[PDB]
Each structure stands twice: as structure tokens, then as C-alpha cells.
């Protein structure tokens, strides 16, 4: 139980920009925080880091106080955009953060080689790209065995081989027993790696739980399409016998929106007649689940091309 | 050359006193007897244009009220209007009108002559090289030239090697030099007025003399020129508006070693005072440098204190304060910068004189005093005008 937020309803300016979020985070889970209209996304970020005071509620990080120095050596925070110190070098920036966090100096040369930055080490930060600064920003987050990562969009401005390898580096730290929070706005791609999502909107934490739970608590159509079908004309109608509208947009692109109540017999319809090649059960993704819970609180569906 | 007895003088009093009646005369005239001759106001003694008109050879003659006209112009033979011989000691020349192209009053070798109240209009067409002197004095001891009116002569009141004599209250207008001094040791001149003159006061090689209370209105290019004067005294002079025609200097001190220069008023000229390099360390305190476009021109690097007994001069551009209420200012006043003497040392800096870099260099001197050359400063300058009476 790493992050135990309990009863917190943060008020400032008598505005009440956060309300009653009870966000318990497990000791090995990877939570995700996604905020749109609500300012909860940034306030809760601060609240766990300890640089904000919880009015009317308590935040318990690692079972202890959030502003103790003994727990703040075990955190890691990758901020939004950190152009660190443009005249300093790569080693000298990370040795500066190693001296502050109390980490041993033998970690600095083996974190600039763990992150792919040893070729660009001993070079000034003004000669770094945005992706190399995100590489350096991750390197101070893994400084001195942190038991709680807290990443604020770690994969922005980053090339996709390093993006896929970052989540493999995250998957190393999940097995080590370190809880990670992935607060992002680039929601397709993070749904394969988090364990529990937490969509909070208009202050109130709307939905929390795993991805299998959020599809159970929200009736959304599952999109089975079978690309490369043999016959297409009877496949326009043969799914509608149990109420699954087999609507297609191409020569064979029948994205059958089902109801999640007849999943045996529609595949018995699919496998009883006609052979498939590559079935595509397209689950309602984290992009589609987000716009249901957003619409359920305050949002009304935007027009045809009007955002 | 006829004589004064060849006229018709009607005697008013029988003590060798004669009186010429109204009516014109002709030719030169000569005094050989001690006659205190007076004249009616219509006594127009008009000579023909040659020779000295009224030559005087007898001592103790009170010539009064005559009106002389059109004498000679040969300055080499000294064709004067009133020639006074060395034997004509203690002559009085009172209240006369003169108009002619030569010397007005030429005296030489005389003692105690009194040239009082005359009006000498010199010329109009001669090129100020043959107009002759207004009141020429040539090596006289004891003279008293007072309250005359000399106009349009050449070089005004010329004085050559004359020791003790006073020049009191005479108005000198539209001439080349106002008062010319040549080797006049222990002289004096008080309250003279000089107007529209190419040099107001020529002080050449005359020591130990007193120059007091004189006024110079709208002279050209030289207010008071002093060459080689020692132990002099310049107290109360009013030098106003020396226009160009030189660029215009209210006082030009050239090789004058010792002199006390106090209580003067140098007003509205282009240069307030020009101090040459040879003329240094003399008591200059209490003057009023108002309205001049440039106060001191001193092309040197030697320091020059301009305040005797802790009292300095009043400067119009003195932007200083006085906290303790005495008459003196609190901060010293340097009238010249270092870039204010680069303009004088090198005339090509006149092209650069409006540049911001020169305006930068004026500010660097006020912040960094190591680059300040030792100039012509005065500790304790005056706050108010000391010459409140000299403006009349």
C-alpha cells in the first residue's frame, strides 16, 4: 500500500477544486491518472509529492507522512518538461541530483549507461534534444532505489524504440516491488501497461479499477471485426439474429458492435460457417472508456467536426 | 604758422586772460605766452587741413571752450589738433569739440596737463591706419585726462611710457582700441566706458597700475587684453557681450605674472577668460562669470587654484549646493573637462564634438577622477552675484 489518499477534498480560494478522492494504490500496481476538465490531475500529483497541504483530508505516502525527508529519498518524479541546466554537462547534472537525493556515486555512471545516454554523456544540455532530456529526466527518477515512481508524461517527444523499451524498464521495476504512477494525456498506448486506471473529472474521482473492471461497469459495444472474410453479403445480416449490427465501411471491414451477451453463439455463427483469417476482437479501449466516464459527469458529446 | 595774438581776442580780465568772440577763423595757431584763453561757443577755429591747428609752447595755459576743425593728417610730422610742447607744462584743455583727420590731443614730455571734458570726433572714411590718435600721451608724468568723449579715432587714448596719470570717466566709442598702454609703469584708470571697439583695453607691458570700474559694452573679439603686466590690480571691471569679428574673449591674459583680479563681471561673451600657459599663479577671486558660452580657456595640465583667502568666483553654470549657510559653495568647480581641451589642442575633434562617445567621456571624468588632468579649478565658489552694483 504505497499511496494511501483518504478523504481528501482540497479547497483553495473557497473553490473546492478536489473532492473526496479515496485513491489507494497497491504495492506493485501501476496506476494511471487521467484528467481533462478537472484540475484534479495536477493537484493530486502535487499532493502525493508532499509539496502541497491537504485541506480536509490526509495523504499517506509509503505509510508515513508525505513531507518527511526519509520517504522523499524513496520517490522519483519525472516532471512535464525539464530543460535542466543548459551550461552543465550530462554527468554533472546527474551527479548534482545524486548528491541531493543521498544516492551513492557509483549509480551515476551506471544510470547514464542504463538509460541510452552514455554516447551523449559529458556533453552540454543545450546540445540535447527533447527526447534526450526525457532520457535524462528519467535518470534522476531512478536514483537510489526508489520505491515509488511518479511520472508526468514520460514518453513525450520520444522515439518509439525507446518508448517501448521504457515500459520494459517499467516492467523491470514492477517486479522489483515499486509502485509506479503514469499520469498521461496520450492514453492510447498506456492501456497495455497499467494495471488500474483512475479517471478523475470535475474534482470527483469518477472511476477507478482495472481495465477489465471498467468495461464491466460500463456497457460499451465490443467491436469484433474479421478482416479478410470469404463472403460478405450474408455476413451483413447473419450477426443481427442475436442483435449484433454487422456494419462495414470497406470491401470487408465489418466491425460488428456486439452486446457482450451472446459471445458464444456469434462465434459459433462465425466458426460454424465461413473460415476466418485474423479475428480482431477490438475491446473498448482506454480512449473510448474515457469519453464515457467524462460524458457521465459533465460532458456533452461534441458535434461533427467541432473540436 | 600764425599765432594766437594775431586774432582778435576781447579781454574779459586783465590777468593774461583772453576771450575769442563768435566767428570763424583760418589756419594754424601758436601759443607763446601763458594765456588762459577762453572762447565763446561760436568760436569755430577751422584750419585748412594742414599742420597742427593749435600748437602750444607756453606753460600754464587754460584753453577753454574752443572748437577746432579740419587740421592736418601727417602723423609722421604729428599734425595734431592740440599739440603741446614739453615746455608747455600744466596746460588745461577744457570742453572742446574737434573734428579732423589727425591727432586730437598730442602731448609729449609734459607734466600735470589736464585734458578735461572734450569731445573728439575723429573720422569716417580713413581705414583706421591713418586716423590718428584721440588723446595721444607720449612720456608724461602727472597728467589728468578726465571725462572726455573720443569717437572714431585710431586706437583711442594711446599712452606711451607715461608714468603717473589718471583716466577718469571718459567715453570711447567706435574706435579700434579703447585705451592703449605702452610701458606705462604705475598708471591708473577709473570708470571709463568703451563701446563697439575691436579691443576694449590694451594693456601692453605696463606694470603696477590700477584698472578699476571700467565698462565695455559690445566690443569686438577682445574685452580686456593684458600683455606682460606685473603687480597690477583689476577691480570692478564690467565686460559685457564681446562679440566675434578672435572668437570673442572678455579677458585675455597673456604673460601677466602678478596681478589681483577681483570683483569683475564677464558677461555674455564667447570666452569668459583666456589664460595662457605663461601667465600663472595670480590672485583671481570674486569675479562673476555669467552667460558666457565657455568660461575658462586654459590649455595646460598644471593645477591652478582660483580662490585667495578661501573665497572663489561666481559661476553661472555652477550646479552646486551650499548646506552650511555661508556665501561659499560646498563642492569645487572645474570649468574645463579633459575633452574640453582636446577641442583646443586638436581642431579635428570639432567633427566628433557632438558624438555620444564625447558625451560618454564627459561622464567618465565625473565618475573616474584618475583621468582628470589638473585644471583651473576653484575651491569654494560663490553662490550669489557679488557685482550687484556694476550692472548700471
Amino acid at each position: 500500500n504505497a499511496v494511501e489518499i483518504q478523504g481528501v477534498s482540497q479547497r483553495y480560494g473557497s473553490m473546492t477544486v478536489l473532492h473526496d478522492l479515496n485513491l489507494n494504490l497497491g504495492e506493485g500496481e501501476v496506476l494511471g491518472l487521467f484528467g481533462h476538465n478537472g484540475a484534479g490531475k495536477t493537484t493530486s500529483m502535487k499532493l502525493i509529492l508532499g509539496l502541497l497541504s491537504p485541506s480536509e483530508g490526509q495523504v499517506k505516502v509509503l505509510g508515513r507522512a508525505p513531507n518527511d525527508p526519509q520517504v522523499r529519498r524513496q520517490l522519483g518524479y519525472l516532471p512535464e518538461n525539464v530543460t535542466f541546466y543548459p551550461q552543465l554537462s550530462g554527468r554533472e547534472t546527474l551527479r548534482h541530483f545524486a548528491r541531493l537525493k543521498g544516492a551513492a556515486l557509483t549509480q551515476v555512471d551506471e544510470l547514464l549507461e542504463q538509460v541510452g545516454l552514455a554516447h551523449a554523456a559529458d556533453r552540454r544540455v543545450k546540445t540535447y534534444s527533447k527526447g534526450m532530456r526525457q532520457r535524462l529526466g528519467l535518470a534522476q527518477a531512478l536514483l537510489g532505489e526508489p520505491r515509488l515512481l511518479l511520472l508526468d508524461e514520460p514518453t513525450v517527444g520520444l522515439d518509439p524504440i525507446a518508448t517501448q523499451d521504457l515500459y520494459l524498464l517499467i516492467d523491470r521495476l514492477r517486479q522489483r516491488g515499486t509502485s509506479i504512477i503514469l499520469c498521461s494525456h496520450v492514453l492510447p498506448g498506456v492501456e497495455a501497461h497499467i494495471n488500474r486506471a483512475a479517471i478523475l473529472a470535475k474534482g470527483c474521482l469518477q472511476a477507478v479499477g482495472s481495465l477489465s473492471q471498467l468495461r464491466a461497469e460500463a456497457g460499451l459495444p465490443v467491436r469484433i471485426r474479421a478482416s479478410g472474410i470469404s463472403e460478405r453479403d450474408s455476413w451483413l445480416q447473419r450477426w443481427t439474429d442475436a442483435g449484433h449490427s454487422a456494419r462495414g465501411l470497406s470491401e470487408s471491414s465489418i466491425e460488428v458492435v456486439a452486446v457482450n451477451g451472446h459471445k458464444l453463439v456469434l462465434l459459433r455463427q462465425l466458426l460454424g460457417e465461413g473460415e476466418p483469417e485474423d479475428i480482431e476482437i477490438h475491446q473498448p479501449s482506454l480512449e473510448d472508456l474515457y469519453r464515457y466516464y467524462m460524458e457521465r459527469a459533465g460532458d456533452v458529446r461534441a458535434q461533427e467536426g467541432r473540436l | 604758422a600764425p599765432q594766437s595774438i594775431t586774432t582778435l581776442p576781447l579781454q574779459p580780465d586783465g590777468e593774461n586772460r583772453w576771450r575769442l568772440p563768435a566767428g570763424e577763423y583760418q589756419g594754424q595757431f601758436t601759443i607763446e605766452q601763458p594765456m588762459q584763453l577762453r572762447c565763446e561757443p561760436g568760436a569755430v577755429i577751422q584750419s585748412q587741413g594742414q599742420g597742427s591747428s593749435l600748437l602750444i609752447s607756453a606753460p600754464d595755459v587754460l584753453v577753454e571752450g574752443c572748437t577746432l576743425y579740419e587740421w592736418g593728417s601727417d602723423l609722421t610730422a604729428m599734425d595734431s589738433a592740440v599739440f603741446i610742447l614739453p615746455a608747455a607744462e600744466r596746460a588745461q584743455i577744457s570742453n572742446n569739440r574737434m573734428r579732423g583727420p589727425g591727432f586730437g590731443v598730442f602731448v609729449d614730455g609734459t607734466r600735470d596737463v589736464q585734458v578735461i571734458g572734450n569731445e573728439i570726433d575723429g573720422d569716417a572714411g580713413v581705414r583706421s591706419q591713418d586716423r590718428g590718435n584721440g588723446i595721444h600721451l607720449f612720456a608724461v608724468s602727472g597728467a589728468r585726462v578726465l571725462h572726455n568723449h573720443v569717437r572714431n579715432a585710431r586706437d583711442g587714448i594711446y599712452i606711451d611710457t607715461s608714468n603717473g596719470n589718471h583716466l577718469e570717466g571718459n567715453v570711447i566709442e567706435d574706435v579700434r582700441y579703447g585705451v592703449h598702454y605702452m610701458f606705462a609703469n604705475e598708471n591708473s584708470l577709473i570708470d571709463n566706458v568703451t563701446r563697439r571697439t575691436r579691443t576694449g583695453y590694451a594693456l601692453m607691458q605696463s606694470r603696477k597700475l590700477t584698472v578699476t570700474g571700467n565698462r565695455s559694452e559690445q566690443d569686438q573679439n577682445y574685452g580686456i587684453l593684458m600683455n606682460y603686466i606685473t603687480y597690477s590690480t583689476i577691480t570692478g571691471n564690467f565686460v559685457s557681450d564681446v562679440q566675434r569679428g578672435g572668437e570673442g574673449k572678455a579677458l585675455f591674459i597673456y604673460n601677466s605674472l602678478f596681478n589681483t583680479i577681483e570683483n569683475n563681471h564677464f558677461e555674455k561673451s564667447s570666452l569668459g577668460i583666456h589664460l595662457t600657459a605663461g601667465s600663472e599663479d595670480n590672485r583671481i577671486s570674486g569675479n562673476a562669470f555669467v552667460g558666457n558660452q565657455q568660461q575658462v580657456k586654459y590649455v595646460a595640465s598644471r593645477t591652478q587654484e582660483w580662490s585667495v583667502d578661501g573665497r572663489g568666483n561666481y559661476w553661472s553654470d555652477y550646479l552646486g549646493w551650499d548646506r552650511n549657510n555661508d556665501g561659499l559653495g560646498d563642492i569645487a568647480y572645474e570649468p574645463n573637462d579633459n575633452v574640453d581641451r582636446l577641442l583646443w589642442l586638436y581642431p579635428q575633434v570639432r567633427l566628433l564634438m557632438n558624438s555620444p562617445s564625447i558625451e560618454v567621456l564627459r561622464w567618465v571624468q565625473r565618475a573616474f577622477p584618475v583621468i582628470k588632468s589638473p585644471g583651473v579649478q576653484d575651491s569654494h565658489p560663490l553662490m550669489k552675484l557679488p557685482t550687484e552694483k556694476l550692472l548700471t
Binding site: E80, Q87, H96, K101 | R323, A332, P369, V370
Partner: protein, 267 residues
């Protein structure tokens, strides 16, 4: 200690600033050039009032070039919000920046007045070496204090603003006001009133400007002439001794650091 670990950064960040090393070498090559003219003129009270006038233009300039982007350059750079999630306080990342930027000014004036002393002991023959070390010892431990005033001034105008482009406009305003505007408003107050505004309050207005308290400390011994001081001639009318002028220079740090810390505490 955590205050020294962030001082070692700023000691290694100001020394890579090429704009500092240009105008701190300018302080060294002018302090040789001023002291060379002070040797050729021999003069002694003019090379003291000109060296103190050189450090009036440059020791606030190096201090405001360092620390105008000390807090707001880290806030909009993102690295300030990260730094509070380290085991630190807001009092340690300000006093640490004051120690770290303070040793740069302690080296920028030890280079400047250090090479100025070697352009006197090797230039003017027969100078008093005891009086030279005392005069340049008073110049070294008081131009740091003038530098540490404007260092603490720069933390006030960095915590208050929220944009570095507006911090450079305000730091130029602080450098213009305290150096060459406060000397000109006080001059124009004395000229236009002809010294009759207040005959006793006006010497106390020199203590409201730390560049003038800096000039009043070094011009204690070498008064010399009268025109070397200029507007500093009111310092003869100040009844305070020299030791209070040191403490009024230290009080200009301590109020302008506690103001800089109370602003940063509610950032």
C-alpha cells in the same frame, strides 16, 4: 550538508557563463588600467575613489547577471518543482544559491583587486606595503558585501516575477536605480532646492543606497581633495562612525535576504 551540495552546482554553473567571464575580466583589466594611471600621476586619493567607482558599476552588474534567473529561471525551466521533491527545503535552495553565487563574486573581486595590487606594488616604487595591503584588504571585504547586497536584491526580483524576460527588465531597473539614478535624484534635490531643503535629513539619505554606503566605507582614510567626492561630500555631515557603515551594509543583506526568503516561501 544539503546547502553545500547545491552550492557546488552554482559554483560550476556561473563559471561556465561566458557573459560573466567577459565582464569579470573587464573588472580585472580596468583595475589594472586605473591603477596604472594612478602610478603615472605620482594621485593616491584619486585612485581610491576611482576604484570604488569601478566596483560600483561592475559588482552590482556581475551580481545581477548571476542571480536574476536564479529562482524564476528554475521555475519556468521546470527544475524548481522537481527540486522541492528532493530532501530539501525552500530555505536550503536559496541560502545555497546565495553561498554558491557569493563565492563567484568572492573570486571575481579577488581576481580584480588582486591584479590591481600587483599593478601597484610592481609599478609605484616605495609605496607603503602595509598601507597597501590594508587599503586593498578593505576593498576586498567590502566589494563582496556590495556584491552580496545585489545578489540578495536579485533573489527578491526573481521570486516575485513569473517570467524570465520580465525579470531581466526588472534587474536592469534595479541596476539603473541604485547606481546612477539615486545619485542623480539626490543631486537634483540639492541643486533645485539650493541645499535648503533639509540641512540635517539629507546626509541620512545616503544610507538608503548601498552603492553609496560602499563609497563611504572606502573613502574614510583618503578624503584628500574636495572634488574627488562629488555628491559623497554629504558623508562628512554623517555623524555615524565607520563601524556602523559596515553594519548598515550588513543590514542591507539581512533585510534583503529575509525579504527574499519570505517571498520564496509563498511562491
Amino acid at each position: 550538508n544539503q546547502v553545500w551540495n547545491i552550492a557546488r552546482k552554482e559554483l560550476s554553473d556561473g563559471l561556465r557563463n561566458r557573459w560573466l567571464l567577459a565582464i569579470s575580466l573587464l573588472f580585472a583589466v580596468l583595475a589594472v588600467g586605473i591603477a596604472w594611471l594612478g602610478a603615472a600621476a605620482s594621485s593616491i586619493p584619486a585612485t581610491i575613489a576611482s576604484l570604488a567607482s569601478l566596483a560600483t558599476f561592475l559588482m552590482p552588474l556581475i551580481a545581477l547577471l548571476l542571480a536574476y534567473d536564479a529562482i524564476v529561471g528554475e521555475d519556468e525551466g521546470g527544475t524548481l518543482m522537481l527540486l522541492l521533491t528532493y530532501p530539501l527545503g525552500r530555505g536550503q535552495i536559496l541560502l545555497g544559491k546565495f553561498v554558491g553565487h557569493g563565492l563567484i563574486l568572492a573570486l571575481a573581486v579577488l581576481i580584480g583587486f588582486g591584479c590591481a595590487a600587483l599593478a601597484i606594488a610592481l609599478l609605484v616604487e616605495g609605496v607603503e606595503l602595509g598601507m597597501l595591503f590594508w587599503a586593498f584588504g578593505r576593498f576586498m571585504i567590502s566589494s563582496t558585501l556590495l556584491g552580496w547586497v545585489f545578489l540578495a536584491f536579485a533573489y527578491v526580483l526573481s521570486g516575485k516575477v513569473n517570467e524570465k524576460s520580465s525579470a531581466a527588465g526588472l534587474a536592469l531597473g534595479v541596476w539603473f536605480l541604485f547606481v546612477l539614478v539615486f545619485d542623480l535624484v539626490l543631486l537634483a534635490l540639492l541643486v533645485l532646492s539650493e541645499g535648503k531643503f533639509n540641512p540635517e535629513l539629507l546626509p541620512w539619505l545616503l544610507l538608503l543606497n548601498p552603492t553609496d554606503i560602499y563609497r563611504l566605507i572606502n573613502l574614510s582614510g583618503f578624503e584628500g581633495s574636495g572634488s574627488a567626492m562629488g555628491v559623497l561630500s554629504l558623508g562628512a555631515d554623517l555623524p555615524v562612525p565607520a563601524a556602523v557603515l559596515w553594519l548598515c551594509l550588513l543590514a542591507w543583506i539581512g533585510v534583503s535576504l529575509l525579504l527574499a526568503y519570505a517571498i520564496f516561501r509563498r511562491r
